[PDB]
Design a binder for this molecule. Sequence first.
Ligand code: TYR
Ligand code: MG
Length: 215
Amino acid sequence: HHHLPAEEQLALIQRGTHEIISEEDLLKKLKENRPLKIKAGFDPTAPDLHLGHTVLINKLKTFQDLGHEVTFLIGDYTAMIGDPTRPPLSREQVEANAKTYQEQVFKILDPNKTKVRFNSEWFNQKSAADLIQLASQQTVSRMLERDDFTKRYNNHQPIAIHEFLYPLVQGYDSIALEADVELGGTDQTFNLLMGRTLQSRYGQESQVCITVPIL
Ligand SMILES: N[C@@H](Cc1ccc(O)cc1)C(=O)O
Ligand SMILES: [Mg+2]
């Protein structure tokens, strides 16, 4: 009735997913009978999204057709930070690549119902002190559990320290968006849980994390 019953939405949402960190909390959010904020983030370095993102985008469409609010999030903030004088992305590259992603995903999603946002929109105004505050919320040993970090460390390959900050940027993005749900590939599990974790540390209701296989 304007919004499908919560248990039916659940059945449609979980079809084709590998994991949902807290079915219990997703049901609780759906029973609130309100538009949920759906976060899906993309790295703007590639020329396009490959044909394996399809399940992911059709899951965002499922959320959109159930009345929920999808934020298409471009993570330009970290991509544009260079080395103190290999170049980073320029703003013109971010904008050009982002336009191509939108031409793609709006063959599926509705543009009048989708929010396109760039995480530099809030992070460009964060101070070093705001990032030190964020960095105090996770430990070194927890960051070293991310599978790619664990392999590099075990093979004594260098891990620059700012690479530990990148998951914290992604987590904070959930806070600034007030994400109810975040979607990603099964490879991005660690990073999606970062936002759920950091939301609690900041006194926010935590997001549900949903992974789909990225073919
Ligand atoms: N870091 C993610 C992309 C991303 C960026 C910012 C976010 O808030 C969320 C996701 C990746 O490597 O694909
Ligand atoms: Mg923006």
